[PDB]
Design goal:
The complex is a heterodimer of chains A (about 190) and B (about 190). With about 190 residues, chain A is α/β, with parallel strands linked by helices. In chain A, about 35% of the residues lie in helices and about 20% in strands. In chain A, a hairpin with a 2-residue loop joins β10 and β11. Chain A is globular, with a radius of gyration of 15 Å. In chain A, about 55% of the residues are buried. Chain B has one domain: Class I glutamine amidotransferase (GATase) domain (Rossmann fold), CATH 3.40.50. The chains are: A alpha/beta (about 190), B alpha/beta (about 190). At the A-B interface, α1 and β4 of A face α1 and β4 of B. β4 of chain A pairs antiparallel with β4 of chain B, so a sheet runs across the interface. Chains A, B: Its EC number is 3.1.2.-, 3.5.1.-, 3.5.1.124.
Chain lengths: ~190, ~190
């Protein structure tokens, strides 16, 4: 009955873009699984914050399917996601089953690497735009949060709450989103 | 030299109110030490995100003094901070040395527990106002970020960026604060 979310955590991930969505989704009653790309070991994020995943991606991948697969940003983190064959398979399967895919900041560049959702209108961190647009497989947007069907993208740490709340609305509805939002004291 | 910051991490701390300041301060070139209240073991935050401290508070306390002591929020986390004799001593020392003390959400209630900065104008998460105002030792504010001398407070996850940038400006200046802010893509 409860929606499930898979958050793929790789070394170099932007910790704020990882923690805000995980926190907000759990406030929404979503069962969130933080899966480590390299395994079950703790992950050293971009600003040295060390986060211990709930499980390895290899294991979490066997506990699917998920209502949403979340790709945090962070330059080095995104590169790790982009080079992962496991991630490629996870996203292809999610896209095939018509499941939501959400990526923030540099995270969307992983979609390009795995040829996911070509033709979609997307946004990324301003510094990741060129990389994301290489080949013109997507149409760029400056919106803080962009949702084109089952592809949901966002721009950076500063858009993480909007990003997370958009995921919540897509999975649990806007009433729940509004309920979760109020206590956050967002402007 | 570079400024130093001490972030006291206790079980039940709100992970967003912990990670955002740590991340933003490090982007500001501030040497941040995430110290675990109970020790050097991983800490289970309010929304189950597990964070590994850089060191135990016991050891971090020996590497002082710090230019700012940061108290994250989270109902249960703030309660642990409020009940800690180690925290009481650290804050008293910081207050006596005229060093900055910054607390967010429920975090300010730890200031009350340790009789820190009485008379200061402060803010807290709306649900922590009554606890903070017990006895009328402070004057309450609705401002998203309140700074009365060396006592800096904020309201919640949604004010974490404002809170963190306020700390940066207080330690490294308005110029550095603006430089760090731009890449965040804040609204």
């Amino acid at each position: 009955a409860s929606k499930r979310a898979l958050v793929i955590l790789a070394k170099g991930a932007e910790e704020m873009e990882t923690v805000i969505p995980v926190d907000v989704m759990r406030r929404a009653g979503i069962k969130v699984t933080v899966a480590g790309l390299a395994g079950k070991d703790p992950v050293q994020c971009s600003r040295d914050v060390v986060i211990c995943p709930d499980a390895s991606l290899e294991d979490a991948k066997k506990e699917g399917p998920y209502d949403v697969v979340v790709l945090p940003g962070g330059n080095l983190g995104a590169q790790n996601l982009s080079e992962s064959a496991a991630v490629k398979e996870i996203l292809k399967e999610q896209e095939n089953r018509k499941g939501l895919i959400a990526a923030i900041a540099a995270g969307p560049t992983a979609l390009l690497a795995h040829e996911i959702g070509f033709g979609s209108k997307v946004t990324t961190h301003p510094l990741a735009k060129d990389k994301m647009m290489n080949g013109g497989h997507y149409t760029y947007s400056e919106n803080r949060v962009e949702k084109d069907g089952l592809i949901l993208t966002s721009r950076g740490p500063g858009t993480s709450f909007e990003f997370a709340l958009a995921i919540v609305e897509a999975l649990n509805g806007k009433e729940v989103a509004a309920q979760v939002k109020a206590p956050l004291v967002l402007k």
